[PDB]
Amino acid sequence: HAQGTFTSDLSKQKDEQRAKLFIEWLAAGGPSSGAPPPS
Ligand SMILES: *C(=O)CC[C@H](NC(=O)CC[C@H](NC(=O)CCCCCCCCCCCCCCC)C(=O)O)C(=O)O
């Protein structure tokens, strides 16, 4: 539905930011960094 397009895009926008924070956390060390992951 119209929502299907938007909710999926809006989550893609957010999911992307969430994933990018996870990548920046992996770059920081991942479990090695010491900081919990963005979760
Ligand atoms: C971005 O585009 C918008 C996305 C947004 N969706 C969410 O925020 C979904 C979050 C939701 N989690 C929570 O809201 C946190 C609370 C979860 C509570 C779970 C309760 C489970 C048991 C309930 C039993 C009820 C029994 C009957 C009572 C009469 C999630 O993870 O989905 C949006 O706006 O859609």
First to last CA, the chain: 30
For ligand 1, say whether the CB of 33 is within 6 Å of any of its atoms.
no
**Cβ contact 38:20 at 8 Å:** no
CB burial of 5-39 (b: ≥16 within 10 Å; e: otherwise) equals eeeeeeeeeeeeeeeeeeeebeeeeeeeeeeeeee
- 16, 11, 9: which is closest to 38 by C-alpha? 16
CA separation (Å) from 2 to 6, 14, 23? 7, 18, 31
Q: Which atom of ligand 1 is nearest to the CA of 10?
A: 2
Tell me how the structure was determined.
Answer: NMR
For ligand 1, say whether the CB of 9 is within 6 Å of any of its atoms.
no
For ligand 1, say whether the CB of 26 is within 6 Å of any of its atoms.
no
For ligand 1, say whether the CB of 13 is within 6 Å of any of its atoms.
no
